[PDB]
Amino acid sequence: SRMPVIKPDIANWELSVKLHDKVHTVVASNNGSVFSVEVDGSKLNVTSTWNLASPLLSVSVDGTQRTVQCLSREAGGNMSIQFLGTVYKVNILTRLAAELNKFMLEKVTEDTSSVLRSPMPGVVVAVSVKPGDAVAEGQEICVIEAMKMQNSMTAGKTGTVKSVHCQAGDTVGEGDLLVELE
Amino acid sequence: SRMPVIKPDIANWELSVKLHDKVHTVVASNNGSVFSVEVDGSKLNVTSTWNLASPLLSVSVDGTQRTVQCLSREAGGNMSIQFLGTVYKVN
Amino acid sequence: TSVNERIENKRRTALLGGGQRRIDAQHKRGKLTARERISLLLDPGSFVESDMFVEHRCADFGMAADKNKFPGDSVVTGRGRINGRLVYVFSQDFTVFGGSLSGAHAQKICKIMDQAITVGAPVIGLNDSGGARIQEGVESLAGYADIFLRNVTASGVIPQISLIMGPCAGGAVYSPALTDFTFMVKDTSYLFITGPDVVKSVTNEDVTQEELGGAKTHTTMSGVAHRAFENDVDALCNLRDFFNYLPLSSQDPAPVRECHDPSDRLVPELDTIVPLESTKAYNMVDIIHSVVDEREFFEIMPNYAKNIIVGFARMNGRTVGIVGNQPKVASGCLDINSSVKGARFVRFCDAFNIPLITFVDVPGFLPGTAQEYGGIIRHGAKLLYAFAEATVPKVTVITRKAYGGAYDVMSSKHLCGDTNYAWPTAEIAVMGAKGAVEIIFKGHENVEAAQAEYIEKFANPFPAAVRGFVDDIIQPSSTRARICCDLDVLASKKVQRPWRKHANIPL
Amino acid sequence: VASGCLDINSSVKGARFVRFCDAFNIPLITFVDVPGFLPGTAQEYGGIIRHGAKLLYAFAEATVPKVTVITRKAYGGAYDVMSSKHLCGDTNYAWPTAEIAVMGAKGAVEIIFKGHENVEAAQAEYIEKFANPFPAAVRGFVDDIIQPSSTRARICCDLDVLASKKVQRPWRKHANIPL
Amino acid sequence: TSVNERIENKRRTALLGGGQRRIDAQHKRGKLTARERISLLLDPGSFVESDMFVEHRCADFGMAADKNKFPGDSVVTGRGRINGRLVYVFSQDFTVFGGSLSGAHAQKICKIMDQAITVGAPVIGLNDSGGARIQEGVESLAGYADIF
Ligand SMILES: CCC(=O)SCCNC(=O)CCNC(=O)[C@H](O)C(C)(C)COP(=O)(O)OP(=O)(O)OC[C@H]1O[C@@H](n2cnc3c(N)ncnc32)[C@H](O)[C@@H]1OP(=O)(O)O
Ligand SMILES: *C(=O)CCCC[C@@H]1SC[C@@H]2NC(=O)N[C@@H]21
Ligand SMILES: *C(=O)CCCC[C@@H]1SC[C@@H]2NC(=O)N[C@@H]21
DSSP: OOSOOOOOOOOOEEEEEEOSSOEEEEEEEEOSSEEEEEETTEEEEEEEOOOTTSSOEEEEETTEEEEEEEEEEOTTSEEEEEETTEEEEEEEEEHHHHHHHTTSOOOOOOOOTTEEEOSSOEEEEEEOOOTTOEEOTTOEEEEEESSSOOEEEEOSSOEEEEEEOSOTTOEEOTTOEEEEEO | OOSOOOOOOOOOEEEEEEOSSOEEEEEEEEOSSEEEEEETTEEEEEEEOOOTTSSOEEEEETTEEEEEEEEEEOTTSOEEEEETTEEEEEO | OOHHHHHHHHHHHHHHTTOHHHHHHHHHTTOOOHHHHHHHHSOTTOOEEOOTTOOOOOOTTSTTSGGGOOTTTTEEEEEEEETTEEEEEEEEOTTSGGGOBOHHHHHHHHHHHHHHHHHTOOEEEEEOOOOBOTTTTTHHHHHHHHHHHHHHHTTTTSOEEEEEOSOOOGGGGGHHHHSSEEEEETTTOBOOSSOHHHHHHHSSOOOOHHHHHBHHHHHHTSOOOSEEESSHHHHHHHHHHHHTTSOSSTTSOOOBOOOOSOTTOOOGGGTTTSOSSTTOOOOTHHHHHHHSGGGOOEESOTTSSTTEEEEEEEETTEEEEEEEEOTTSGGGOBOHHHHHHHHHHHHHHHHTTOOEEEEEEEOOBOOSHHHHTTTHHHHHHHHHHHHHTOOSOEEEEEEEEEETTHHHHTTOGGGTOSEEEEOTTOEEESSOHHHHHHHHTTTOSOHHHHHHHHHHHHSSSHHHHTTTSOSEEOOGGGHHHHHHHHHHHHTTOOOOOOOOSSOOOOO | OGGGOBOHHHHHHHHHHHHHHHHTTOOEEEEEEEOOBOOSHHHHTTTHHHHHHHHHHHHHTOOSOEEEEEEEEEETTHHHHTTOGGGTOSEEEEOTTOEEESSOHHHHHHHHTTTOSOHHHHHHHHHHHHSSSHHHHTTTSOSEEOOGGGHHHHHHHHHHHHTTOOOOOOOOSSOOOOO | OOHHHHHHHHHHHHHHTTOHHHHHHHHHTTOOOHHHHHHHHSOTTOOEEOOTTOOOOOOSSSTTOGGGOOTTTTEEEEEEEETTEEEEEEEEOTTSGGGOBOHHHHHHHHHHHHHHHHHTOOEEEEOOOOOBOTTTTTHHHHHHHHHO
């Protein structure tokens, strides 16, 4: 009551929707429970109750009944949507954000998921591996022990171990290399 | 108590006292109930109780007993003082 | 030439600012202009520009030449809305005199600072400056002082958010220290008083621009920046989302928004998160994400002081602040860095009527001379103070460890808390069984036998609960339901405190 | 000590003291002689920015009498941090040896005349005009320039008339110090 | 030239204000100067002058002329006492640009207005002015608005 809020009168949402390697032009408008969406000239009508908290969202698209799951959302437009069992990555920007985003530098960093370093100083009490051992994503590799706890270090890469640099009984600091994957 | 008032430390009052057609140099200082006044080099001591509301002000000037009346005062220095029956105008 | 022609010519120049060639360079560097950044931040069409025709009044150094006067004098100021909610903004334009601060520059920013305080609307600044404009001399120093005075006056009255979108040097680098949150853009924004040129000239040390004041340094090591975002477009998209959490003024209650997440659902996933073995760590974030509405959590300083987690979330539509321990890092112990981040967050949320939820799992304090000589005592008092003086709802749940003085520091009930829940795995004690029993039975025989009896009686949450320290012991799966119930009845809470000119925080 | 520069440790001690004195209505006297901030990675990585804001905040929010005298240097942002008049100060005095500037003559002139010939000749003119307390005083930054011998008398006069000072500030549940 | 010499030279000019010849004319017309009026009004020795070294910043129509600068910019401001009681005063000096009002002129008066309100002391103004200083233009109009 102190600060009136005025809902923007947005009649049309102009979106740039990037899939794998294509960018599609999509314009949507709301008519209540149904969104009228033009996808590169094709007219679709998506009707739902749009309960945004449920893990299962039931939609009807031009009479076709679909069930989809939204797994993650980011403010930057990234959405992870499972459609017919497969997770698709879509980046939805507004027209303005997409037009200006072209001015950003395409910097690329290195993925160093094979280099497993100690997150915490202490004594190494277990190593689950030797070179050649299979490693799954999330697999425990090393356990460190400081202030009588068991900090567990897991792999971020599937593969086999190339080298084990620190053994049980060794003392390691923060950032020291424990195991190197292939 | 909110706004302390500090009495100016005025040790000497240097006055220019104009009578009829003469201007005299007078310097006065306060020593309590008595003012020590130098009038063109002459030393006088004026002792009184200085009750400023009474129509009759009794003063003693170097042992000489006088009664005077102050009839009017102005902020501009004008005073009308009756001395020995005669009203004198002093600025 | 008519007056209308002159007006149109000034409008066109104000939009170009420093000129098209500088704008071209602005994009080459991978940066947006000050006006493009505002268009992204605010609701389309909601922005109204103020004082677009103001120019400097400088005269020395030939700064009073035609080729030297620009309209707008390096700042874009005005007002708008984000999702219908009133907000004031300003953005510094680097293409005009390097974004340096003039007298008139500051004046325009102060004007926005005064309107926002009077009405009670947040101010979001987009900072990018090369420092003071030396051509004016001391006029720019007064500019900084006036801005600083407004930033202090607005504290606890309106939220102040500062997003850094480029370099910042000189006196300008202190405004984010007075605002509530500071955000940066990775590899684009810098914060430092003097550049590497001065460091090399003064002392025999070798440093580059990124090492001295880059975004990675301030979000990972110094604890100055609350979060860095990858680029300009993502930074403003996340800023809009962050804005939606906060009230417009401290006179307003925490905002409540439409929510589809049932408030009475259970979270069975919690019953097995906390191991029975005391030396096994777990990720506190798994608990936070499962309790909060629709599993959305906004984490602050993800890479700094990782042993304590603070951030924003909603429960049943209402914005709340969450503080908790992270047992994975340094056993969940308190240290200097964690106390600084915690106290700052708690105090902001209290000032703007945002309830606090505390997830306690803390075995004590980080030992060692590194902390003793660092003033761990003086710094730990900051977090205890921030909780003790709070007047907003405080809901504490203890998930496992609470040993020693850390019990009270992490918002215990005896600091005017509202409710305090324990999970069956909680243990509240002055210290663990080993220390307590060896000290109590010091020099006695059969200490291990006495320890077995001690553990059976005290190694559990009951000797504290039966004394009134804990209100209930709940199945972890019900945690969300219990918190939701408390938040919706403590929201009308009001308390009084003795009058004091101002608080005196231990510092 | 350290040329009189501000650093992390000095800001912590200063801010704490200033805040206590303000809370209990004890006037503040400031003696300014500060060339800037202590440079180096030891301070940058230590959060010198976050910590310096503590002393600026402590002065800016003060509501008790503040009397500042500048005895010599006041360069850069340190001028405002050390309780400058534009932070709701009551009086600000300079001694004849005071110099108020964004930076010293060397930095300011080489930056202003960057790439120009006869910079040293321009520096001589710059020093004569700006290396003194006057370009600040004529703009209202300084109330008077006093013979140092009179400093005590001037301060005493201000303290005995600012003691009845009262100001208002917008209501806030509590203050939000940068920490 | 040392800084102390420059300071002394500014002090001497601030006391003369518009200059001795102007002061001579001031007396010929039967008027006291702004500083003589304050000395009469306030308790002897109680007056403390503020911002005596402030000069205008205006540059236009030859105002940037050193021969056009007058320390004090046509007003004498400060504080004192009458019979021991605190009072703030200011007095406009007609001998400096006719006593016309500049931006800086008003600023100094406003400064006195703000200190007096904060402590709770009366303000006594001695006014004498030819109006706005047209060389600055609209700066003097803002001056009036702030005083009002
Ligand atoms: C200490 C007390 C204070 O608060 S006053 C401190 C003032 N000192 C400074 O900040 C020095 C200015 N420079 C720096 O700090 C750094 O070198 C900066 C400029 C931040 C690094 O940014 P960088 O990307 O290298 O920009 P740059 O040096 O090419 O400058 C870009 C354009 O802006 C200009 N600029 C910059 N600073 C000023 C300034 N203070 N006054 C006037 N103009 C300035 C530059 O000349 C440049 O314009 P151009 O590209 O040469 O046409
Ligand atoms: C092993 O037996 C001893 C561990 C050290 C004590 C720990 S370190 C962190 C906690 N804080 C504290 O004061 N003691 C606990
Ligand atoms: C010598 O020519 C350079 C000295 C270094 C600069 C000094 S160090 C302390 C002051 N603060 C600052 O930012 N610069 C000054």
